[PDB]
Amino acid sequence: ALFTAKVTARGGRAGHITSDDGVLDFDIVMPNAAAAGQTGTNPEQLFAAGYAACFGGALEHVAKEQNIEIDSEIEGQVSLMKDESDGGFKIGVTLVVNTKDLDREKAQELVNAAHEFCPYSKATRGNVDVKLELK
Template structure:
């Protein structure tokens, strides 16, 4: 089904933790979202000195720099910024998509999604971990929940995602 490295990564991502769950989460056990049909694939390549290298995706090229808080120059983008940008755009799109079904298109037109991605040491693992704070302005709780449930980034973080990892 999955290569051995993917199974190990997937198994470790399925462990439940004592970290408080989102108000939208109803169960502590994680599931895994699998795809039956791929509609679009984005690709990216990172090169150089990791967090101080470059990243490219379909004509977009960015210079990366370790944030000052982590001992770097801060003179470039970092993966957490890129994740926050992608997640905020995806969640806004999801909110606007489900707003049509709920008859709340007008409300969603002026919605604003603010996402903070925090990088730090997790209490239960070695290395670094992520935490995400989301604040959405201009919509009600019903639309927020529906958008959060519909958003692929939200689902990947709350329900897990299949990660296939291997050497090239």
């Protein structure tokens, strides 16, 4: 292990998360948060944030390998969905990649390489149908 990040979640779908280091400190909120005057995050948003960040790191590393400096914005879009197999729930993911002035052919190549490197892509491979979009 290079490092272990620790976060404690108390109390379920209306609960609260505090990272070991205090950097993360939030309520977990339900769909009616605005109406109820609550503020916070949820597991989908946390997923979106992590995957966006993971993918940016991966894109930067693959580019580096080719001595390319990239200026990127990655929008992670994580959807909660009904799991008809189960009567339960599952996740859907889209990543919209903005690589600014990078030639598009190169952008396409590095996005694919990034998807093979990013630990979140590896963790979800074959379970989630991760859609990759360039702009």
